[PDB]
Ligand binder design. Structure first.
Ligand code: 8WE
Ligand code: GTP
Ligand code: ACP
Ligand code: GDP
Ligand code: 8WB
Ligand code: CA
Ligand code: MG
Ligand code: MG
Ligand code: MG
Lengths: 420, 353, 54, 440
């Protein structure tokens, strides 16, 4: 199990995804033209996980760029590393999805999905042993949300035994483009609950607050939020991208982080986030301010945690400090999953830092995220507000009732394990 | 922050230790089955010693010595003594005792009658007592001068028992012509230092000693629970039939022209050390992956010659009400904070070995 | 304390010391277990594909 | 001469197997290319070392070993490592996707597909044996391959080689050492399925090896390489009697005869002494009495547990180096009067002693100092049931909420196999209790 197929859909999924390939291309020593110029062989050992090797010693991201309108893709092609993607791996239409999940899922997106699946199959067929798929997208718009979840369904149908992993940006009223975001997100969460194995939940308000309250950026842009996401995505994929103590792939991750199939929505975090020591990395990576789901972990309990340290540092002080925090936060870890906190280390630090830490928590506190979405959804749905945008695409109110009912069920299942 | 768990609800001693640990601000009580504790205050039975000492990054400490039951069960005490050369069949401070398993369930039944018959050829006091660990507070015992009556009682019971020579010449406190027993509290720490709490207690009897009838049993048994239920003058001479060392030492001076230390404590200290040094190789945690301490209750009898006799060792003792605060503080100071420092004139006598 | 069965050679020796005297499933059944587990995997998959068809 | 086939399953089994064959080559003077100059019978012989090594016409001495893993990266290191030339390709078997830490994936889904190839490769080795005595099987409890594929392989070995002894070396899971959350499930599932197929199994607790490596070798953060070089020392001291001239433990059946009176209670405790750091320049050498008394210190045991609080059924002392029987007898008498050594009253209080005169060999540049004398004690004590209690308890915490169970059911395993496996461990814990505890 080596190759991962990456998919990025819609404006948000494509802008975060572009940044992700920029960051990991740097780490692995690939330049904007796909040529390797690295000082270490740790960089090439697991390069095939994310890059196809072409003739001429070039490495091409195993990446598929999807959108229902051309703008963001054009931006990407003109971007820093735009020329590194396979040109025939851009798949886009002209109409757009109007921030409308029904257009992404059922109409506009349905017209385009087969050609996306052609490229997916072409990337999969040239895999020695496909691990699975990683999708980047937002849940609040139309393409990444509606078409993204459509893609996931059709990938599951064609590759039912592969791991499906998403980086899903969750809308917040504080950092919002349209009022329909709660509708699009409630509809998508229903899909994610049934069809992914691992979903990193990234809350745009959490990203904003980190940029504004902690990093002291007077006026964050989406670019500032996306720099945080790409840093975190580099962190959570370190163990896939570099050798180490662990034999780490997407399946071992799901087996160890997901005790019940539906509870697979992780809170990620990054450290340091300050405006230099191991105890500093460790204290930060465990407080709410470094987490990206806008959920207070102290309001719930961790079922499982994965922590990945990067840089030269004392493994002894690492293990020592991890074991310390588990007593400061003794009550916030469930007692019926022994040894549910896994530490991994990588020697290679991210650019611009001597050391760093990425946190992946499966905490019952993430129920707060789905509660917020559910309340916003219900405030509008009780009055059927904005629904004509969806009924106009052939959808029926009952599909909204079922999505709301499924998400409220999800909330109740988290609460069940928080009292166990 | 240090962490501990409570697994014996009915413990007066550790209930107080628990409280003191919170009151220092640096101890958190976790839930009963949380494995990431520094200290376990264990259950009295089937404590999971096998689960201690495998939590990485945690020094773990438990308030019981695994194996100490060998001293703290009446039948095993007898066995241990007769089979350990340091103690021996010839031990001078332990009453002649035999393990008698009842037929309705190796047995020393024959060896007992052999020595019993010798005494019958004596006109010497041939009174004995049958006891067991299944005793309640405090019934479950029989005092008889007749051998067949003792084996009849035990076989009525169908449980492991011991027969033990009754001390026919107890030291009798005056006024009152009354019998007593001495309880000493002993704390053994993780280094196997043996600490005798400077405060003991005599559990006195309020009824004059009566060699005529061992049938009554109230002037013969010194248990506090007994005296409150089947007595006559419970509380006449001392509050709660509890005499403490300061008064008892004064008594020994005034009446006998000696001291508690010379006439009794040397022997108590000798016995305690003997018993505990004997089992030390079997129960010591010096090189174990977890650590133990334990509080013991030693019960002694004094004869009219001022000779001290070990009666039994209790592995889960309660304290006297007047002494809880001092002793429990002493546990925290000596057995816990010694392993987990927080941030006098000791109340204990260290028994050197 | 007595020693018995002392054997010596150029490479070493062995002996015993006594301190006190004393007082399957067939291939068919396996294949069936592995096929029954495979049937269950296939059944769960068909349910998934049937749900995706809906 | 009767041959032994070693089988190494999964990452732990393969990496431990690597350490062992490396050490065996040092002990017998076999070079990484397989040439053995001290071997005068070229292409053939029935020397003691031939139980583990066959020989080609070109003078190459080839381990009687199969390495199997459901993923290729660990065995690939063998294929390209220092000892690549030792093994031929047919004896290195890899699949493509591993068991993902999931017993059910290794046992059912993926194991079904590779098991027949493994047997074919093992049959090739068997066909070169004039008198195969059986198999030494190395694996982790916690890995999906080490647990699941191993239990499948053991079942099939009992069918295809019903009269042959099967010994295990099993790595018991420790959170100090890269343990996955579901390792207690896998450990219990594989123990249940393997119990009736294994004649004798030596458990090595990674926590004990880790601590010995920290405390005696002054390695702050032991790697698998550190851990495996120490384990291979113990394994080699356990197998030396099959590989060298001697009269104690000369065939696999003798391990059962000398250590396992009750067949289910087949888990001897290994204790090993002395373990001395090679970086420790000045070191005084330990006496027979000293290394033998060390065998009763929990800190030197392969599994941390308290033998004072259980009973012994059998006890073997395996010495390497400058040791004569007189010192062993004087050491034992001394220890018998200083230690809590209670036997069950239906076995004699006694020790079987084996001395090999060649001192332990150590890997050049390793962490272990050369010593004049070492000893491995194999004792079948009920105290080892502590390790089952610990593991069963972690199983219980998770299973009570059915955590992670869906991953196993998802590969075609029935939930009931969990409770069946757990009830079998409950019974096993009872067996140790009735064997070794006085009711009083
Ligand atoms: C992204 C770099 C950018 O384009 C912007 C800058 C050049 C600077 C980025 C700085 C950054 O965001 O720093 C944060 C954090 O504020 N830094 C610290 O707290 C540093 C030391 C504190 C000690 C107590 C850290 C981040 C998010 C770094 C990421 C890591 C990546 C993988 C690459 C991006 C480059 O920066
Ligand atoms: N001592 C030691 N333990 C190891 C080694 N490799 C893995 N382990 C332990 O074995 C357990 C993990 O199982 P592995 O052997 O790695 O897994 P596997 O058998 O290859 O199974 P899958 O990878 O799940 O297909 C953990 O308890 C590890 O600590 C090793 O080389 N030495
Ligand atoms: N051999 C003996 N000679 C004289 N009196 C004896 C005796 N054995 C016991 N007694 C009396 O019996 C009383 C209780 O005996 P024992 O101590 O065996 O019971 P017990 O264990 O139920 C109470 P505790 O556990 O608090 O000591 C003692 O206080 C003592 O007075
Ligand atoms: N973090 C982040 N959020 C974005 C970005 N672009 C849009 N969003 C958020 O994504 C949602 C809108 O979806 P979008 O991706 O623009 O629509 P789509 O093209 O139809 O998939 C809203 O929640 C926006 O807040 C981005 O670049 N970064
Ligand atoms: C591919 O990368 C990984 C694969 C597996 C793990 C992992 C996580 C968490 C665990 O316990 C909750 C665990 O036991 C094992 C592995 C993991 O966490 C370290 C990984 O890095 C994030
Ligand atoms: Ca030869
Ligand atoms: Mg948009
Ligand atoms: Mg008592
Ligand atoms: Mg593996």
């Amino acid at each position: 199990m080596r190759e991962i197929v990456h998919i990025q859909a819609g404006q948000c999924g494509n802008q975060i995804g572009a940044k992700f390939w920029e960051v990991i291309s740097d780490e692995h020593g690939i330049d904007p033209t796909g040529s390797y110029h690295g000082d270490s062989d740790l960089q090439l050992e697991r390069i095939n996980v994310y890059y196809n090797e072409a003739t001429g010693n070039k490495y091409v991201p195993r990446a598929i760029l999807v959108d229902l309108e051309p703008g963001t893709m054009d931006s990407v092609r003109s971007g820093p590393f735009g020329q590194i993607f396979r040109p025939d791996n851009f798949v886009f239409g002209q109409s757009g999805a109007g921030n409308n999940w029904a257009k992404g899922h059922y109409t506009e997106g349905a017209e385009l999905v087969d050609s996306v699946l052609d490229v997916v199959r072409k990337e999969s067929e040239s895999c020695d042993c496909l691990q699975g798929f990683q999708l980047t997208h937002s849940l609040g718009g139309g393409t990444g949300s509606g078409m993204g979840t459509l893609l996931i369904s059709k990938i599951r149908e064609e590759y039912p035994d592969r791991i499906m992993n998403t980086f899903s940006v969750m809308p917040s009223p504080k950092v919002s483009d349209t009022v329909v975001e709660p509708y699009n997100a409630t509809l998508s969460v229903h899909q994610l609950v049934e069809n992914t194995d691992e979903t990193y939940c990234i809350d745009n308000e959490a990203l904003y607050d980190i940029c504004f309250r902690t990093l002291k950026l007077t006026t964050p842009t989406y670019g500032d939020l996306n720099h945080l996401v790409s840093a975190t995505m580099s962190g959570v994929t370190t163990c896939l991208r570099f050798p180490g103590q662990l034999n780490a792939d997407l399946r071992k991750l799901a087996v160890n982080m997901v005790p019940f199939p539906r509870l697979h929505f992780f809170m990620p975090g990054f450290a340091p986030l300050t405006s230099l020591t191991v105890p500093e990395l460790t204290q930060q990576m465990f407080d709410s301010k470094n987490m990206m789901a806008a959920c207070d972990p102290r309001h719930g309990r961790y079922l499982t945690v994965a922590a990945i340290f990067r840089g030269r540092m004392s493994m002894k002080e690492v293990d020592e400090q991890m074991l310390n925090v588990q007593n400061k936060n003794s009550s916030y870890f469930v007692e019926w999953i022994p040894n549910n906190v896994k530490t991994a280390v990588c020697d290679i630090p991210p650019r611009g830092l001597k050391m760093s830490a990425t946190f992946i928590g499966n905490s019952t506190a993430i129920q707060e995220l789905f509660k917020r979405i559910s309340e916003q959804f219900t405030a509008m749905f009780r009055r059927k507000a904005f629904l004509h945008w969806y009924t106009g695409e052939g959808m029926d109110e009952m599909e909204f009732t079922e999505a709301e009912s499924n998400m409220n069920d999800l909330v109740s299942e988290y609460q069940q394990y928080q009292d166990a | 922050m240090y962490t501990f768990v409570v697994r014996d609800e009915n413990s007066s001693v550790y209930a107080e230790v628990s409280r003191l640990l919170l009151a220092t601000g640096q101890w958190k009580r976790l839930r009963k089955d949380n494995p990431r504790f520094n200290l376990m205050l264990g259950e009295r039975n089937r404590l999971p010693f096998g689960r201690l000492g495998h939590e990485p990054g945690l020094v773990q400490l438990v308030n019981y010595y695994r194996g100490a039951d060998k001293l703290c069960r009446k039948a095993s005490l007898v066995k241990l003594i007769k089979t350990s050369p340091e103690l021996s069949e010839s031990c001078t401070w332990f009453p002649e005792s035999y393990v008698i398993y009842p037929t309705n369930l190796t047995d020393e039944r024959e060896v007992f009658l052999a020595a019993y018959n010798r005494r019958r050829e004596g006109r010497e006091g041939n009174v004995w007592i049958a006891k067991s660990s299944a005793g309640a507070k405090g019934e479950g015992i029989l005092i008889s001068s007749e051998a067949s009556e003792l084996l009849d009682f035990i076989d009525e019971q169908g449980q492991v028992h011991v027969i033990q020579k009754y001390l026919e010449k107890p030291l009798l406190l005056e006024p009152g012509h009354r019998k007593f027993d001495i309880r000493s509290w002993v704390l053994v720490d993780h280094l196997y230092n043996i600490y005798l709490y400077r405060e003991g207690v005599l559990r006195t009897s309020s009824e004059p000693y009566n060699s005529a009838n061992f049938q009554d049993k109230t002037c013969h048994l010194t248990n506090h629970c007994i005296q409150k239920e089947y007595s006559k003058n419970y509380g006449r001479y001392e509050e709660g039939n509890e005499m403490f060392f300061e008064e008892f030492n004064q008594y020994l001076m005034d009446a006998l022209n000696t001291t508690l230390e010379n006439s009794i404590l040397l022997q108590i200290k000798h016995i305690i050390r003997s018993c505990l040094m004997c089992i030390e190789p079997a129960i010591s945690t010096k090189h174990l992956h977890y650590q133990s301490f334990q509080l013991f209750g030693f019960d002694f009898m004094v004869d009219e010659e001022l000779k001290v006799w070990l009666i039994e060792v209790n592995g889960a003792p309660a304290c006297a009400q007047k002494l809880y605060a001092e002793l429990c503080q002493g546990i925290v100071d000596v057995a816990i904070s010694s392993v987990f420092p927080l941030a006098p004139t000791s109340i204990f006598i260290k028994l050197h070995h | 304390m007595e020693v018995i069965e002392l054997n010596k050679c150029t490479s070493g020796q062995s002996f015993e010391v006594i301190l006190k005297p004393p007082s399957d499933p067939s291939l068919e059944e396996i294949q069936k277990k592995l096929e029954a587990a495979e049937e269950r995997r296939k059944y769960q998959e068909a349910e998934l594909l049937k749900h995706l068809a809906e | 001469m009767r041959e032994c086939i070693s089988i190494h399953v999964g990452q732990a089994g393969v990496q431990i197997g690597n350490a062992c064959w490396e050490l065996y080559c040092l002990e017998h003077g076999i070079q990484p290319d397989g040439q053995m100059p001290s071997d005068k019978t070229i292409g053939g012989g029935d020397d003691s070392f031939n139980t583990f090594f066959s020989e080609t016409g070109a003078g190459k001495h080839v381990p009687r070993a199969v390495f199997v893993d459901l993923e290729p990266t660990v065995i690939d290191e063998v294929r390209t490592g220092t000892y690549r030339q030792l093994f031929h390709p047919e004896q290195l078997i890899t699949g493509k996707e591993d068991a993902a830490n999931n017993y059910a994936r290794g046992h059912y889904t993926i194991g079904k597909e590779i098991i027949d190839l493994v047997l074919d490769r093992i049959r090739k080795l068997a066909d070169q044996c004039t008198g195969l005595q059986g198999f030494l099987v190395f694996h982790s409890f916690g890995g999906g391959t080490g647990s699941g594929f191993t239990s499948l392989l053991m079942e099939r070995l009992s069918v295809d080689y019903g009269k042959k002894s099967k010994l295990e070396f099993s790595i018991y899971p420790a959170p100090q050492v890269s343990t996955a959350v579901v390792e207690p499930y896998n450990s219990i599932l594989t123990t249940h399925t393997t119990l009736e197929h294994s004649d004798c199994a030596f458990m090595v607790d990674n926590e004990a090896i880790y601590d010995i490596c920290r405390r005696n070798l002054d390695i702050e953060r032991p790697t698998y390489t550190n851990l495996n070089r120490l384990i291979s020392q113990i394994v080699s001291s356990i197998t030396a009697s099959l590989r060298f001239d001697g009269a104690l433990n000369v065939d696999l059946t003798e391990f059962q005869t000398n250590l396992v009176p009750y067949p289910r209670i087949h888990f001897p405790l290994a204790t090993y002494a002395p373990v001395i750091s090679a970086e420790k320049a000045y070191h005084e050498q330990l006496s027979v009495a000293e290394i033998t008394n060390a065998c009763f210190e929990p800190a030197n045991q392969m599994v941390k547990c308290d033998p004072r609080h259980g009973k012994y059924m059998a006890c073997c002392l395996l010495y390497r180096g400058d040791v004569v029987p007189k010192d062993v007898n004087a050491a034992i008498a001394t220890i018998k009067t200083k230690r809590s050594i209670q036997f069950v009253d239906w076995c004699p209080t006694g020790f079987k002693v084996g001395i090999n005169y060649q001192p332990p060999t150590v890997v050049p540049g390793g962490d272990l100092a050369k010593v004049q004398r070492a000893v491995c004690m194999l004792s079948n004590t009920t105290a080892i049931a502590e390790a089952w209690a610990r593991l069963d308890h972690k199983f219980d915490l998770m299973y009570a909420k059915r955590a992670f169970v869906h991953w196993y059911v998802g590969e075609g395993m029935e939930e009931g196999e969990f409770s069946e496996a757990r009830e079998d461990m409950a019974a096993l814990e009872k067996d140790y209790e009735e064997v070794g505890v006085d009711s009083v």
